[PDB]
Amino acid sequence: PVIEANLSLNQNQLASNGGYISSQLGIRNESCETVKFKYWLSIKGPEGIYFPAKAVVGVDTAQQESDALTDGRMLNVTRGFWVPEYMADGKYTVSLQVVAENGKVFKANQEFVKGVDLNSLPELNGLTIDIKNQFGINSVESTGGFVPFTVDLNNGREGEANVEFWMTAVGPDGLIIPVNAREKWVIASGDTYSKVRGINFDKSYPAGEYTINAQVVDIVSGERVEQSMTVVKK
Amino acid sequence: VIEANLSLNQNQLASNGGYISSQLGIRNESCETVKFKYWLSIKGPEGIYFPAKAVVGVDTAQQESDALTDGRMLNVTRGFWVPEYMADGKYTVSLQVVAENGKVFKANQEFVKGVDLNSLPELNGLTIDIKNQFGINSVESTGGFVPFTVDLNNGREGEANVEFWMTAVGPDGLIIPVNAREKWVIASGDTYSKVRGINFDKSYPAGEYTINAQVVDIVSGERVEQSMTVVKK
């Protein structure tokens, strides 16, 4: 019982004043028997924003209904959503999510930005943050694995920058795993805090999805900025 | 297998932040000797997640394993700073133990910063009251229904314009709609009051679901959150 899910956005790039985004959802039953499943469209944004794409004028009373697909058949839906002005500027993730009757989870994600450039590194006002999965390693075995991350904090400002920086891995069973302890830094003008920092996914760590999350706070302004990568333990 | 506790010397920090000293207890209740890894992590508002542990230099350490004799208990004092620049609001401290066999054990305490302990989140007179109606903290693998009471009380002298929604953030990257995005004009002294439940379908994966409600003031742009945790066995 395998489902194939895709998602595409008619646009990636919203200005600060927000806007409308029209999406195209594709759900294909690649299996031989007929398949029942639930699906929905959800948005995840900065500052712990999580919201459903779906909006209603009245009182939301609906429960999550099941759907179905004929053998080899595909569902095709257009779905649009507003992203209002009052929502935080930053990087957003739209997620088509399918839960099949058998427990298997399938997803398709697209990103968009609001009030910043699609290509751009997160920044604290000249101080740019560059965190990357160094070797494109997107999973580790049940028996364990090591994934290294490159960390580059570049002070583009004309003055010194005072920052606190840390990393966690948010994962199953409510786990928040320290990846990098809280570090305080004075970074001089034009200078760079640059290093490699890895996480060892111990054999004993539970199977599932780990969200590798890095944060940087400007100690003076109080602006906080994030970057995230996903690693799955099989 | 493992018994974990956590207590805080302080629950209540002012806006200018402060220091919190914690006491970690880890007890091996098992008959054989047990190996495990453990750590201390903080979760706050606005998607804040940070490790309790801080270093002045370059963090270079790896997550070391520990061990406990049969019936033996580990006892550690561990403190952490919560600086002024961190967001005001409700925080969760979490002692987390991962045993060599895969079993996860936790002990959580809450604290607040710049607001009263157990106070209702508010958007400036507009108070938000979301509660697990019947104290149901888990559902069986075969499924279950958990209802939530929702009370949005406009204490202001003028009308309040809000947008409101709910999700359940859970395993395998799932963000499950619990309440669609609703726009509301709430008159002075009035209440948006209702019950809203989530059906944890048999098919939903085992694990930890974070029931999350958010309210935005459309005029000010202030956003406020309330969260409750439900585990599917």
Author numbering:
A (entry chain H): 38 to 271
B (entry chain G): 39 to 271
Text of the article:
RbmA is a 26.4 KDa protein, with putative carbohydrate binding activity, which is found within the biofilm matrix, mediating cell-cell and cell-biofilm contacts.
Furthermore, soaking experiments with a variety of monosaccharides resulted in the crystals immediately dissolving. As an alternative, a co-crystallization of RbmA with the 18-crown-6 ether was attempted. Crown ethers bind proteins, bridging axially bound lysines to polar amino-acids, with equatorial interactions with tryptophanes and other aromatic residues (Lee, C.-C. et al. in press), and have been shown to occlude ligand accessible channels. Since negatively charged glycans can bind to similar pockets, a crown ether was used as a probe in co-crystallization experiments. Within each chain, one 18-crown-6 ether molecule was deeply embedded in the wide groove, bound between K51 in the A-domain, and T218 in the B‑domain. Furthermore, all dimers containing crown-ethers had their tight grooves protected by the O-loop conformation, perhaps due to the interaction between the 18-crown-6 ethers and Y87. Crown ether dependent protein stability was studied via 60 ns molecular dynamics simulations. These stabilize RbmA in the closed, compact conformation, which is preferentially adopted in the crystal.
